[model samples]
Every structure is written in structure tokens, then in C-alpha cells.
Target: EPSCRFAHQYTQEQVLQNPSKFINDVLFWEGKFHQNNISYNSGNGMSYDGTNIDWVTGEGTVKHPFSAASKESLQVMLYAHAIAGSADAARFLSPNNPSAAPGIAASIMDTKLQTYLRFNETYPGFGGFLPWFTSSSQDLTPTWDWNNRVPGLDNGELLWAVYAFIQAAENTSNKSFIDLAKKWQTWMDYTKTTAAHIFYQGEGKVCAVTDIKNQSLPVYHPEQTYACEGTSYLNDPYQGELFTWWLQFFGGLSDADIEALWEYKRPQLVSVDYHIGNVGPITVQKGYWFSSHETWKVLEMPYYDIDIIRRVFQNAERARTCNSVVTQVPGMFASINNVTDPATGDVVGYISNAGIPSIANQTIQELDVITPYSVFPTVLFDKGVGMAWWRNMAIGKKMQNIYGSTESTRRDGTGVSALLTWDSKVSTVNAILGGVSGLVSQKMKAENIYNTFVERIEAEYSRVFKNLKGEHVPFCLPQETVPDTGLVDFTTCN
Candidate 1:
């Protein structure tokens, strides 16, 4: 009993025919957790596997032969799916108990991951897996020895689930199912390595990587131990001796370890000078982006950044400055409103596309860099994330319109989910689809309701400046000429 058409209502059948390419076509759109990113501040970006390209493949090959290097983690993850999951769900998830800890971890891990989604046009529809490696044997290594092969392993955080990609033989069950997860959890449970510290998998063997390298390095030995690799980065070993790296561990590492590693270390993220009266530094910052995003930075601030902020203040200050319109030239606020060439005083600023935070009318708002970092990653904050909704609908429609297709829609849950989930940001369609399905009791013909209800999700994204306290002031983005909000108290040195 299909409803009679009014203004060309899309029948349930036509809806199906539309084949919603939203999930597929709009794979690159942001909002939720965007997994694949490869970039640098200028020359300073890195990929998922820590490569500098925007995307790369598993077998350590570039996506495009003539290209610089692929730093796209999504592309690599796609390869991981086919290679590890065998392009079959049941086969991938239905793990056959592995013997070794690494193998078992791989089996279960693959299922947990692949149980999420398929790229490159899932089933009834087509086209979602965005580029990189097209076939096998290139950047598509079926084996997951990311530890041995990927760089900086001297202190490599071992991926126990590497075994998950072990293709099971036909007519038999061996390294199948989500056994990889089990082994990983089990190995973490079993290897009670307390201090030598190489944690991240779990409780038990968490401390295999005992020594701390308290240093910032983009290129290092992947498998090298902390003591040998990171401990030597200081002149005064006392202060210079922090840990080599940080534990991005959410689920695996214990509280003590987490606190020890990340509690106070803010090297990767810092308050940048967006001009308005912004704080700290980006151009002169040590750990992250030395390059800048001039206009892109201005648009995204809580208000108009440096240049505009300066103008507002300038208008107010005009009476004191002899009624000179030259004050509006952003000549005062050097950071955001203006930048002078070292040799030439051509006064540069104001028109940087990469400097604007929110492009007018363009939901395709991106914070691009003026120049790539000498080492700062393009996806610095989060694979280039951090653009969340103080209000969800804006980002929601951004997602919808970005994904809104004439043919079909996208995978329902392409965006980020509740931050609590350990692997919450695995920007794939499968997991979100499953998660949302669990939310609804039944599917009703309520597009508007569904859309509103979807965007209405509260626990969307989090903010740092809002929660920053005591001694965390330097991390503030300065406005123009005025003292910052005094949110925190952190600052960089001369």
C-alpha cells in the first residue's frame, strides 16, 4: 500500500533505487571521526602509520606510484579489511581460536574492526572506499607485522591483533573468528610486565615498554625500546628525561601509566596565536606546526579572530589615532592581522584562505595550512579534527548536505560517536550503523524527525579550553590587542 504521490514523494522503492551513496560518496566529509589523514604543519605532518603522506598502504607502498607517499590511514584500513577479513564478514568475524597471543589478538581484532564496514561500495550500492592501493601485493600486506616493518619500532607499540588478518584455510577453522581480540586481551592479562613498560594492549603485559623517552620525535626506531630510543633527548638528563612517547591508551593501559605519560605532557597540542589576542605560538612553537593557517584560523574562533577583532578595537581606538583609516590595516596586531616578509615589508595577512576558520556559506569549512609544517601534521589536533558542534545541527546538516545524494545516501554512522567508546573514532559506516540501529525500536517514515533526532545527540564532541584550569593559560588562542579570556596559564618561551 504505497502512498499516492503529492509533490513527487520518493517511494520506498525509489529510495532504495537512489542507492544512497551518502556513505560511499561522502566518505571524505567530516563531522564524525575521520580516520584517514596524512599531512604536516608545513613539512611536519604524519599519517596513521606515522608516515608523512596523506595516505599509504600496508605493504609500505605508496597509493599512487608517481605520488610522493600515501599517508591516508583510511585507504590502508580498507586494505586491512580485505586482507585481514578476506572481504567476507562471517569469515572475518568467525575466528578459529589462535594459539599464540599475537595471532589470537589478530583474529578477534579483525572481527571487531571488520564487523564495522566495508569500503569500495559495500553491497547493494557502490563506491565508498576512497583510493590508495587498488590491488594486493602493493601497499596491501595481508600479514600484520606492523611492529617489525613500520618505523620507530625500537619502542614499537605492538599490534597484537596482527594475527587477525591471518587468512584461514578453506574447509577448516583455525585462525578465524574474533580470536585476535581474545588473545590480545589475554596476552595483556598474562604478561605481567610491570615496569619495563611497553603498554597499550592491556593490563597484564602493559609495561613491556618500561623506560620513558620524554622526547618529541617524528622519525625514530619503531621497535626500539624506550631506554635506548627516547631517554637521550636532553642535555640535563634530569629535566631532559621525560618519556620517549605518550600512551594514547584509553582502554588498555592502567590509570597509573596513563597519568604518568599524558597527565601533563601537552607537546602535541598547545594554545596557538590566531591573532585576535590569541596566545602562545604556532610560528615559533617548538613541538607542533611552525607553519600557519591564516584565514582559516580567523573564521573558526569563538568570534572573528585577530584581523576582525583588531578592526573592532581599531574602530574604538580611532579617536586616539588621529582619525587615520590606516589603523584598519591590521598594522598593529602583528600575529593574526599581519605578517611582514623578512626582507620585504609587503605586509601580508587578511586574505589567507587557509587562515579563515569558518568559510561563509560553505559547510565545507576546513582549517588549511598556509604552508605545510616543517614537521607539524595537518591532522595535528586529531587527524585534522577538533571542528565540533557547540550545537550539533550545523555539523549534522554539514554531514547531511555533504552526504546528501541524488542517487543514494551514506552509511548512517559515518561520523564520530560517543567519545567514551575506546575505539570510538573509527570513522567507518558499519559500527555507527549498528550502534544507531540499537538506538531505534523501529524504522518510521520520519525523515525530518530522524534527521533532527540524529543531530540532537548531545554527547557529540568535547572542548579543551572550556575545561582548562590552573597553569594551563598559555594554551589560549589570542584575540587582537586584548588580553585573552584568561582560561588557562600556559605559555611558550622566547
Candidate 2:
């Protein structure tokens, strides 16, 4: 479908009959699962990983499989809708169905905002932050499932969460959300002090291939033992980009701090050495990946100074469009929809790289084509060519980020390639792209497209209400709900 046209997409009737069939179709049936998964009650509502759902227990497992806590992409999408004056922005929050997109988004964020307030609140065992991380950071603040996996924090996740929380505050004028923003500021300050490597300002260059060190973040062993890592990533390039991009939203570093960072790592970074066929940069042996776009931007100091940042942003922009063009299907905003089969857990489509392999292990059996799986959530959850393109791309330009080139091939190889992009593919295909996608536009034009879809669903609801068991809307089927089995206590539902 063209970004504006919304053609060749699913109709309303299709969604109601087999919402289950649409679970991960990548068609307009997205967002339904996300709507269902949101917990209507609790601290900063939970965005479950679509697993561990037991309606009887109202419990879920721990995992950031798709950056669940760091859903900035979706936050941005909704903020874009409300701030840009999309007609349905307000409506989204008040749909007749208790499990609609806006309502779910608001519920999830409302609970997320509660984290800082209740951070110290009693949990099953965690009473303070120490037990929270020995080897990793707190991925789920509310759930605090410190046992699930890694224990370190990441800049991108923190940054996006902060942005989303702040945006929620702006949209609702909710004092709680505003208060949460303050807590985030406090949290950011804590991170800078607690984990300096996140804002490392040293005099050494780090390469992309360099092994990441948990220098600043607290480290722990499997038994909850503690150990100090290295001097943090004081000499890392990947971190430079992540930190700087985050700082653009909120940072208090001096020019000296930024300059120190520039000197510390710029030289060791890669650049667009070959702008092949205007299809983004490609070297003799490598095809360009989307992350290289942001990685280079950090090297250029994406937001230290407006002039420098602007130029750098343009460079990153070119790299995205040029490179995405080659791999994209014609007329469709690249990767706005790559279907997945919920039953088999298989992706239905793939993006062919810009006529070249963007990654190594390049074989027909490998899905390593040129794309941006690195920051895939940003696009897949937001736009793939996404967010930063807000002003530059035309209204409703699918500039949001997400997706990669190595899907099908990897799927072919291991029979799996879901990675970080799966939740979105599943949630979106089964539920809310239009309401969320509409939010991304500066003028919220996507909201028009969004409402068109929502209206279709609503109309279908009216047409099919008799079969809905007086449920008002056929919002959920057996298979389409998100993993939050606790919805009964939170929402008006039974």
C-alpha cells in the first residue's frame, strides 16, 4: 500500500471473522494484540512479551524480547498523533471497546509512569536496586524479573522510555506522567553517575567489531554475585551514537564532554566510503546497513550544535532512503508491512537488499541483505525509514525505523528469524498499525489513514455484532490477546 493510499490492505470483515488468522499477518490487522496485552491496572501497565499468559494465574514471564519496556517507537507514534492534532487522537483513547489501541497505549504508559514512584515499593523479593542488578540492569521496572536474563542497562532503551513517558505526559496533561518525567530525569542523572560508561568521555577510539565491556554498568554472576567490569565503554563507537542520540532529548554534557567523546572515538569509526548507484553507501566487500546511518551521525555529533547536527542528519537521511530504496518493494513504505504467520511463527515476506548483501554470511540461505535490524524496533514499531524523518520526508512518509534484510534466509536456515521484530509483527498484524501509524505524521495525516482502518473495524463490529456474543466489539478471539491475563482486574471487562 502507498503510504497515503492504504490500498491492497485487509478489509474490516476479514479482521472480525478470523482475528486469529490476522495475529501476525503484517497487514492492517496490527495493534490488536498490543491493545489486549496492556494491563489496565497496576504500576505503569505491563507490555508483556506475548508469552507466559495464564488466564487463571494473571502472571507473565520476564523478557525484553522485542524491547518491551523500551517501546519508544509506539510512544512516538501515539504522541505524533495527539500532538499533530489527528482527529482520532482523542477518540483513540475513548473507543467503545475497552481493548482498543489508544486505550491500551494509555494504560500501558500510565503504568510505566508509575515505575519511578513505586520503584522502591515492595516486590516479591526486591526491596531496593542492589538485588535488581549484579550483571544486568532492570529491564522491567515493575515486574523486576531480575532472573530472566541480562542485567545491564542500555542507552537506547532508557532514552526511548524517557521520550515516551514525557510524550504521554504532554498528551494527557496527567500530573502523574509529568512526575514520571521528573523521575526519569533523576534516573538519567543516576545513570550518568552510576554507569559513567553510558556517557563515557575519554581519549580512545573503539571499533564496531570491538567486544562490548560492561565497565560502568554493575555486573553480577548467575548466583547474584557482584563484580566490577572495565572502565566502561570509554572507547566505544556504537555507544557514542546511542549516547548522543539519547542526549538530543536530554543531556547536560559540556562541549568539552562531547568534544572529548569526538576525539575519543571518531577516528576509529567507518564512513560512507562508497555511495554506490545512489543506493546508499556500499563498499567493495560490504553493502550498507541502516545503523551505519545513525552510527556515522554519532561520529558527527548528531545534536551537540544545530548546524553540525543538521548536516549530519542529512547524511544519515540519504543513507537510509538510498539504501532502503534498493531493498524495498515498490510504492509501499519499505517494511511498513512484512507479514508473519502466527501459527508457525514464520515471517511471510522479506526485503531484498539494495541489490547487494549488506551483511556478511551472505548466501541465498542467509537473509543478510542491506537493512536496519540493529535499530529495527524504532522502524518496525514506528516507521523503518522512520522518526528522524518527521520533517524531512513528506507527510506520512514511512520513515520510522525497524526490520532487517536477513529474515527469510535465516528462517530458511534455522526455521526462525523472529528476533526483536516479532512482537510488533504479531501485535500489529493482529491489531493497531493505523491508529499508531497515524500518530507519526507531523500533521497526523497518517491518522486519516488510521481512522479509515479503525472505522472499517468499527463498522465491521456493527455488522457482525450479533455474532460477537453481545461483546460490543469482536476485539479478541482465543489467540489474539497480548500476554496480560490480568486485564479483568484492570479494565471494565468481566
Candidate 2: count the clashes: 41
Tens digits of lDDT, candidate 2, 1-494: 11211211333345344433322232221222233323112334433333222222212222233233223333434433443344343334323342343434444554554553354342212211222221113334422343322222233433433443344445556565455446555654454442332233334221221122321223322233222233444333332344443332234455565456545544334333224453433221122323322232222111212333223333443444444344431111222223234354444555533232343122232222222222222233223233222112211112111121111112112122232233233322111223332112211232243233234323322332221111121111111111222212101111
Tens digits of lDDT, candidate 1, 1-494: 11111102322233234423222222232221212221111111112321111111111112211111122322222223433333222122222321232332233334333321232113101011111222121232112322112121212112211211222211124434334434433433322232123333322122322232311221132533333222222211011111112122213345565443433333322322222222211111111112122111111111111232323222222211111111221111101112223233222333222222211112232221111110011112211111110011112111121111010001121211101101112222222122112112122112122342223111111111222222222221101121122211101100
The residue-level lDDT of candidate 1 at 59 comes to: 15
The runs of at least 3 residues in candidate 2 whose Cα sits more than 4 Å from the true structure, single-residue gaps closed, are: 1-29, 38-44, 49-107, 115-153, 160-164, 167-180, 183-189, 197-240, 244-258, 273-288, 291-494
Query: What TM-score fits each model?
Result: 0.27, 0.46
Each prediction's RMSD over C-alphas, in Å, is 19.8, 16.3
For residue 236, model 2's alpha carbon misses the true position, in angstroms, by: 6.4
RMSD of 1: 19.8
Worst 10 residues of 1 by lDDT: 415-424
In terms of lDDT, which candidate is strongest? Answer: 2
lDDT of all predictions? 0.21, 0.31
